[PDB]
């Protein structure tokens, strides 16, 4: 329902011109030339040490590639400014941050264990597929919150004690996994985004290797990660490290990020340039605002959670004076004096091929033969978890992103369904 009725957000609260905010806080419209010139002057003045960036939720391959090239030419290497929550996963191998088993792997696995994941709220179609699989042959276990899943599940726990026991092998679920053939482990990105995300990730790696989730004889790799940000998936695909965080940044480039932003993340004295399409959030932290295109208005590439690379096509042109984000970055680089080697989509995609060629095979999942190496458990790692519950980030299914927040149908759905769906208890009927 979100993907069916959230397009209404694109119809209002749309930024349609470059804007600048005065110290008093009075926004005023300006020309693209003026905005780019002032941004370039700020970039030249600011040393590369105190320049940082934030990746948005709806960032695409082309935009992230242009931003990465521009920051590299400016000598900026840190692409995160938020320190509260960062995804703890290395972008070296695709196998270590993509679902090794495809979306159809649930139809093949016999046991599926979720860690901090709520498929009903995130990827409901995946939840329906899991329902089909569990009705045919599949047993579902859950470590975290006990959400009202449409199918029966075995709730092992909510703390990291269960993970510690499984890793140590004293938990009976270790024997259960060993008995089971083609087991699958699905972990939500929030669990890896926890402060101990690296420790939890290492614990999952060792558990998978010990229990055979990654088996050469079975030729099976059941380790999976369910993401919550298409922009984060694209950044990982292009190789941007999510852990690289600039603690103190004087010049912040927010590429359409509206979730998790807080005043503490942006230093009071910083200069903020926000590439965005809606003004719900991130447009109030911005000293300069640059309109960008949406997914229905940008001819770009998108990599989904399972690693499938698809092409998002242009339906209608960006509203008002909005420009494509990659074009904006190209113009900014040229004005700042570090021109990028691509002037069109074809040349930008040639650069994308330079970085990672597999993104030029649209609607296809490129296999990787380094899954075992990437997910192998190293010796001497921390693997020390915290005694706290594992939770799910989604609270209101109908309000998760800026477009949904700006949508009217989503607001009607929220007011009509939140009170009826909220329940601190579990539906024992199912």
């Amino acid at each position: 329902d979100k993907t069916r009725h959230a397009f209404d957000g694109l119809k209002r609260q749309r930024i349609n011109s470059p804007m600048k905010r005065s110290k008093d806080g009075n926004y005023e419209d300006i020309f693209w030339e003026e905005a780019i010139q002032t941004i370039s002057k700020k970039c030249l003045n600011t040393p590369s040490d105190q320049i940082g960036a934030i990746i948005g939720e709806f960032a695409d391959i082309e935009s992230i590639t242009a931003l990465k090239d521009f920051l590299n030419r400016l000598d900026v290497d840190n692409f995160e400014v938020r320190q509260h929550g960062n995804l703890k996963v290395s972008p070296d191998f695709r196998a270590n941050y993509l679902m090794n088993s495809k979306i159809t792997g649930v139809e093949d696995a016999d046991v599926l264990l979720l860690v901090g994941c709520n498929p009903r709220y995130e990827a409901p179609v995946l939840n329906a597929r899991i329902l089909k699989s569990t009705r045919k042959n599949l047993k579902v276990f859950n470590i975290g919150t006990n959400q009202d899943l449409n199918y029966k599940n075995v709730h092992l726990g909510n703390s990291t004690k269960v993970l510690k026991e499984i890793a140590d092998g004293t938990h009976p679920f270790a024997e259960r996994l060993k008995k089971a053939k083609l087991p699958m482990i699905m972990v939500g990105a929030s669990a890896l985004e926890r402060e101990d995300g690296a420790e939890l990730y290492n614990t999952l790696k060792v558990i998978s290797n010990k229990t055979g989730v990654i088996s050469e004889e079975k030729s099976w790799n059941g380790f999976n990660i369910l993401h919550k940000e298409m922009g984060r998936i694209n950044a990982l695909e292009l190789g941007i490290n999510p852990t690289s965080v600039n603690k103190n940044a004087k010049l912040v480039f927010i590429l359409g990020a509206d979730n998790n932003l807080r005043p503490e993340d942006i230093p009071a004295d910083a200069f903020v340039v926000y590439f965005g399409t809606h003004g719900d959030e991130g447009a109030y932290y911005a000293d300069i605002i640059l309109p960008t295109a949406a997914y229905t208005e940008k001819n770009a590439t998108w990599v989904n959670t399972e690693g499938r690379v698809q092409q998002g096509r242009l339906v209608v042109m960006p509203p008002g004076d909005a420009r494509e984000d990659w074009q904006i970055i190209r113009a900014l680089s040229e004005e700042a004096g570090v021109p990028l080697p691509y002037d069109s989509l074809e040349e930008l995609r040639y650069r994308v091929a330079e970085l990672a060629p597999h993104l030029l095979k649209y609607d296809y999942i490129e296999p990787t033969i380094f899954g075992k190496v990437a997910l192998s458990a190293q010796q001497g790692v921390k693997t020390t978890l915290s005694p706290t519950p594992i939770t799910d980030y989604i609270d209101n299914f109908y309000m998760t992103d800026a477009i949904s927040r700006a949508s009217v149908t989503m607001a009607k759905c929220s007011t009509a369904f939140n009170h009826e769906k909220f329940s601190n208890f579990k539906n024992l009927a199912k």
Binding site: E216, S219, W220, N221, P367, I369, G371, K372, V373
Partner: protein, 40 residues
Amino acid sequence: SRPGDEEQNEMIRIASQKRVYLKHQRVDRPARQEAAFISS
């Protein structure tokens, strides 16, 4: 006989071939792709 008679015959031959549509062609669910791992 003129030179183009062969081309005309080719056109007539190709015009008589049976034709089917992708929409009505059966497609079976592919089997699970066997994951491969680099040795050593």
